[PDB]
Design goal:
The structure is a homodimer. Chain A has a single domain, classed as Jelly Rolls. Helix content of chain A is about 15%, strand content about 35%. Chain A is built from four helices and 13 strands. In chain A, a hairpin with a 6-residue loop joins strand 1 and strand 2. Chains A and B meet through strand 4, strand 5, strand 7 and strand 12 of A and strand 4, strand 5, strand 7 and strand 12 of B. Chains A, B: This is PCZA361.16. Chains A, B: InterPro entries: RmlC-like, RmlC-like_jellyroll, RmlC_Cupin_sf. Chains A, B: GO terms for molecular function: dTDP-4-dehydrorhamnose 3,5-epimerase activity.
Chain lengths: ~200, ~200
């Protein structure tokens, strides 16, 4: 497994080796040793997993959790192809306002660790695209917020030659800048404090 | 999410609700609230995850970890269709020698919790069948053992109309009864002690 630090502080891209034989294939998308090497502590205790399947051109996001309590996540594409996007919405971060993207396909699988306090989005590049997540806390509707993924200011890589397919909840989301002004974005220091507790060595 | 106790003591089948809209589908395969209600404590800390893809007719198993240290697992089928099998190989268990099966498909997805010390096998019923696992311990070859899935004493449902595709290691694995005589099986009391430690509350 190889790890590569992303441009959003603390986010990490993991590239597992793909093992093949006459029965099929195997990857180990999350590995404690590689994870600790790159992050400095183990994964958060897992509270919930997600399996989402999307049609081509679907854009989901930008999603984040009110912080505190916040949520850290670990995601990979288990079927199909996605452009995964991490957006740094943590006020005070050295990379605040920046985003980075990871192409996730089945030939060269990659997983991404999303720190507490960051935003997540993706676009499905094929039908039947499955995004598989581990989360540090169960989804609580009241704590789950969104930002506009289509915000021309951000210029996310979510246009693939078709009209983006977006839920009304994601479509009506306020922009990063509006959320900042309203005091709705996570604080970087607070997010790192929470993250350090979630990923502490037991 | 609904939980159902399987015939192997401690193994549990979870059935998540499938949410659908014009973008696709979503399930939450692992949910802490439901899991804690059914098992009595939260999932083990996740040491490693697995993404295994198999051709139709592949039979993997029966697999278990030398105990101690043992491995507990949580598994679901993320693509394709599998007959998932849990086999109670724990000497001293009240359900020793029994097995149960869970049909894992994309229409009515089900996940299974496998206690420490049990055996696991499955048959892929479609090509490109993906089995997705969370494990309590990283896979160590020397600690990973096999039992015969074709054992006439068990009568596992693993022949589906094509010649089974089986690794050489699985093909020559000894039977459960023979492994018992040889002293190679997990002990139930030991297994339960490890499981209690892994899944303790706070």
């Amino acid at each position: 497994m190889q790890a590569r630090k992303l441009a959003v502080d603390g986010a990490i891209e993991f590239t597992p080796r793909v093992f093949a034989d006459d029965r099929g294939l195997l990857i180990l998308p999350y590995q404690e040793e590689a994870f600790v090497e790159a992050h400095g502590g183990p994964l958060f205790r897992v509270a919930q997993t997600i399996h989402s399947m999307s049609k081509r051109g679907v854009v989901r996001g930008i999603h984040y959790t009110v912080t505190p309590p916040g949520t850290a996540k670990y995601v990979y594409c288990a079927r199909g192809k996605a452009m995964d996007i991490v957006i740094d919405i943590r006020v005070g971060s050295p990379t605040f306002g920046q985003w980075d993207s990871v192409l996730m396909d089945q030939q060269d699988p990659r997983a991404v660790y999303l720190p507490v306090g960051v935003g997540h989005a993706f676009v499905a590049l094929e039908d039947d695209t499955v995004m598989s997540y581990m989360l540090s806390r169960s989804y609580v509707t009241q704590d789950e917020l969104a930002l506009s993924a289509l915000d021309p200011a951000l210029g996310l890589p979510i246009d693939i030659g078709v009209e983006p397919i977006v839920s009304d909840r994601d479509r009506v989301a306020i922009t990063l800048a509006e959320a900042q002004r309203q005091g709705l974005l996570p604080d970087y220091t607070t997010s790192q404090e929470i993250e350090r507790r979630l990923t502490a060595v037991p």
